[PDB]
Swiss-Prot record, chains A, B:
Expressed by the venom gland. It is found in: Secreted. Keywords: Acetylcholine receptor inhibiting toxin, Disulfide bond, Ion channel impairing toxin, Neurotoxin, Postsynaptic neurotoxin, Secreted, Signal, Toxin. This is Kappa-bungarotoxin. Homodimer and heterodimer; non-covalently linked. GO terms for cellular component: extracellular region.
Length: 67, 67
């Protein structure tokens, strides 16, 4: 069913079977002071658990909602 | 220190000690199409779990990011 925006181009793509949630994740690694968070967009079966190094995490259930 | 928006007024509120995450949950009633999801915003210690009636869940760690 679901189509989501995918990294790195933020282009809409069909989700793999069993993954009906779109996500947008901004996470800081050891290099956040050099280049800021890495942005990841994709499909998931379950909204990921929030981590202490996430600037933000959006999970949503409308097509291409993860922007 | 963390400040988050609180529903329904989009009011910035100082989070209590131990709550460093702002969240926005968009949750649908049984009939959602006319008025859209109910938007709940606040401070929280841990990002909430995603539920079967959620159109979106956002967790973030910058002041007033939960919009």
């Amino acid at each position: 069913m679901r189509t989501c925006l995918i990294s790195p181009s933020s282009t809409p793509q069909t989700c793999p079977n069993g993954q009906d949630i779109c996500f947008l994740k901004a996470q800081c690694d050891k290099f956040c002071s050099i280049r800021g968070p890495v942005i990841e967009q994709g499909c998931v079966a379950t909204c990921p658990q929030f981590r202490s190094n996430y600037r933000s995490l959006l999970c949503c259930t409308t097509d291409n909602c993860n922007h």
